[PDB]
Amino acid sequence: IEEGKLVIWINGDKGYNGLAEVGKKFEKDTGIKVTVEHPDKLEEKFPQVAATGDGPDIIFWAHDRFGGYAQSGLLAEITPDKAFQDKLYPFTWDAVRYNGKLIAYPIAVEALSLIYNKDLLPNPPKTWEEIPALDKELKAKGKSALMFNLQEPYFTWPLIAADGGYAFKYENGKYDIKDVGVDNAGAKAGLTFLVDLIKNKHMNADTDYSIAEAAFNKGETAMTINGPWAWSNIDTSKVNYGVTVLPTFKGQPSKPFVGVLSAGINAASPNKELAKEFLENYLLTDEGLEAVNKDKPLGAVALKSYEEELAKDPRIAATMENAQKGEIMPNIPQMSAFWYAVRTAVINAASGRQTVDEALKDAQTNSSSMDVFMKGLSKAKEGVVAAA
């Protein structure tokens, strides 16, 4: 029963309940119902469902996915006037431009930070290199040094990029998809450090988002790596935590990929004007962002008037410090292939099924191949064998 309502998709780690509250206010004033959903793998489902009755009117995701959506014709060009554009930071609009056109509304700037338990660890490590020794000390006390999601390359990228890894070479506003940097010396060093941590029993190759979060919020591990959305669950656990700069590697800052959470409008929605009214007049206001932020923190928001309030938060300062040491994600269509390729490399290397060099060599080859994700799905289905 989605006909005649605004349907919104947003990731399940974000403040979907707070977003729903904004939706209730919109409905109160306009009579238009707003249904917020948080399907799994929504970023992969969108292209499969956008044209159907199950497609959302509005989709929230980091800006990196939107170029591929726009290439496929799945997103409407948005039409904010100059007065509205002036309300958000200019660099956030840049993140949602594709072939010269605005294709989403920027919401917040997300970057990973080091999150640490101040009771277990008053002075967090400045370097990745000191982490093995630190884990040894904590293991003796029945604790561990560090746990974070090893199944999503988003979380390992800061380390892979620290000493020189890169996705696609950038020059003069353009990315060269033939110049991939996931298999250079810097990338190799980072992933090798990670794999060594696993070989030496300082981390488990199977650690995922849930496992790491439970471990940190139960006080079992001294550190985790995560974004602003995770601060809320840590609050509930009453763990005394700090949010700080990521450790350095080979004396170089970890360099997270920075995402701008953005709201795109489905090109097939018959309610694009209403979606625009909701996004500009309800969500992107102090009251709207406050409701979402109160649910799960957004990070550094794109709306100047509300960032003015949040800027005093030292956790946001750390977020922006890590963000500025990192790099903005490209939004080119090839990003989906790059992410899948790197995800495969990290997982195969961590589990020991491939060496670092083999894994990253394959990642480089596959990073521009658009068929990689679909080919991945086929492998999971195994397939049959003929009698002849």
Ligand SMILES: OC[C@H]1O[C@H](O[C@H]2[C@H](O)[C@@H](O)[C@@H](O)O[C@@H]2CO)[C@H](O)[C@@H](O)[C@@H]1O
């Ligand atoms: O791991 C690859 C993945 O990274 C980014 O996804 C982030 C997302 O930006 C965050 O908002 C949060 O939800 O965590 C995700 C990682 O689990 C890219 O945006 C995404 O396209 C990419 O697949």
